[PDB]
Write an enzyme that holds these catalytic residues in place. Sequence first.
Site, PDB file in Angstrom:
ATOM      1  N   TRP A 225      -2.101  -6.147   4.460  1.00  0.00           N
ATOM      2  CA  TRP A 225      -1.277  -5.116   3.850  1.00  0.00           C
ATOM      3  C   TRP A 225       0.094  -5.013   4.528  1.00  0.00           C
ATOM      4  O   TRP A 225       1.125  -5.168   3.883  1.00  0.00           O
ATOM      5  CB  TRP A 225      -2.013  -3.775   3.870  1.00  0.00           C
ATOM      6  CG  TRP A 225      -1.282  -2.698   3.165  1.00  0.00           C
ATOM      7  CD1 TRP A 225      -1.435  -2.312   1.863  1.00  0.00           C
ATOM      8  CD2 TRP A 225      -0.266  -1.857   3.719  1.00  0.00           C
ATOM      9  NE1 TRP A 225      -0.571  -1.279   1.572  1.00  0.00           N
ATOM     10  CE2 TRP A 225       0.157  -0.983   2.694  1.00  0.00           C
ATOM     11  CE3 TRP A 225       0.328  -1.758   4.984  1.00  0.00           C
ATOM     12  CZ2 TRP A 225       1.150  -0.024   2.894  1.00  0.00           C
ATOM     13  CZ3 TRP A 225       1.308  -0.803   5.184  1.00  0.00           C
ATOM     14  CH2 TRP A 225       1.712   0.051   4.142  1.00  0.00           C
ATOM     15  N   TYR A 229       3.705  -5.407   2.566  1.00  0.00           N
ATOM     16  CA  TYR A 229       4.751  -4.396   2.532  1.00  0.00           C
ATOM     17  C   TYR A 229       5.988  -4.922   3.243  1.00  0.00           C
ATOM     18  O   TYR A 229       7.103  -4.672   2.812  1.00  0.00           O
ATOM     19  CB  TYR A 229       4.281  -3.081   3.162  1.00  0.00           C
ATOM     20  CG  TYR A 229       5.152  -1.884   2.829  1.00  0.00           C
ATOM     21  CD1 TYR A 229       5.100  -1.289   1.570  1.00  0.00           C
ATOM     22  CD2 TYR A 229       6.025  -1.341   3.775  1.00  0.00           C
ATOM     23  CE1 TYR A 229       5.898  -0.183   1.253  1.00  0.00           C
ATOM     24  CE2 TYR A 229       6.831  -0.234   3.469  1.00  0.00           C
ATOM     25  CZ  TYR A 229       6.759   0.341   2.204  1.00  0.00           C
ATOM     26  OH  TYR A 229       7.544   1.437   1.897  1.00  0.00           O
ATOM     27  N   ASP A 245      -4.284  -2.314  -1.606  1.00  0.00           N
ATOM     28  CA  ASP A 245      -3.714  -0.982  -1.441  1.00  0.00           C
ATOM     29  C   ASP A 245      -4.649   0.019  -2.120  1.00  0.00           C
ATOM     30  O   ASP A 245      -5.239  -0.280  -3.162  1.00  0.00           O
ATOM     31  CB  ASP A 245      -2.312  -0.917  -2.056  1.00  0.00           C
ATOM     32  CG  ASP A 245      -1.656   0.443  -1.881  1.00  0.00           C
ATOM     33  OD1 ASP A 245      -0.805   0.582  -0.972  1.00  0.00           O
ATOM     34  OD2 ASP A 245      -1.995   1.373  -2.648  1.00  0.00           O
TER      35      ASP A 245
END
Length: 288
Positions: A225, A229, A245
């Site tokens: 993750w 991002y 997510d």
Amino acid sequence: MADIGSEFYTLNWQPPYDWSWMLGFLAARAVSSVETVADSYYARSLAVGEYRGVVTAIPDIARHTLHINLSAGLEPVAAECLAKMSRLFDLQCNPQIVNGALGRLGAARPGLRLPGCVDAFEQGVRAILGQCVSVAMAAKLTARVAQLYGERLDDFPEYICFPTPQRLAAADPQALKALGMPLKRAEALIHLANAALEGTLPMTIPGDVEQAMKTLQTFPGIGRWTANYFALRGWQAKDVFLPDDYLIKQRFPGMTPAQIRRYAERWKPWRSYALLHIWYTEGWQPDE
DNA sequence: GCAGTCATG
DNA sequence: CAGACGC
């Protein structure tokens, strides 16, 4: 809010563009003493190589341009400063192409852009410090770090530069933890800070993005993750998706991070814009 | 006690 | 694809 410099520059953009949202987003993450965000105004310290100074950016909706003011110390590298503003704001985006390819997903708010950044490393510290905590908490946290390791401006005392790779890879893992984070994190920051310093962390968007994210996750503290991002806000990679997510899978009732991963192929090569939309477009619901 | 996300088999 | 680390 007085002019911080005598030079002004103009950056065009392609409508539609939701500036109110853009600035909202940035204001929620504004690191105290580094950036100042208001109604239609955005300022911040900026270092380009050895040069130092301040940018303000003020949107002009009717002429669809962005107004940039540079401190004098930034004049010799204005061209590069503007490039950072362009990547910070996603100004080169062609919205018709994006929203065309998003179909129904793009309809509600077509002026959504990809909020980028000015420094790849800076985003890095953020992506980490933003882990497991509210947007707001990360901001206060990042404020304490900057205040400690940030470098003040000679001619704008009120402003401080985001901490460099240098002063940060030399940080004591114990002084970091005290500002309010797990020790493990304090090390991730330091490991990142060191990567940048050798050249193991790409400062611009890599050719094989998918392969560079791989490499990232090896870094301690950086999972699938956080690496995602970071590619998004950090390299402004436009084809990136977070099937794992939580807020997303909350919209894909009972689905695997593969049942989704494939559903979002129908949005290649603009998966990042797809992602942003689903998030900040609450009324949206998938096709069964 | 419940999740979120970073780890290994 | 299937254990250890703040509200």
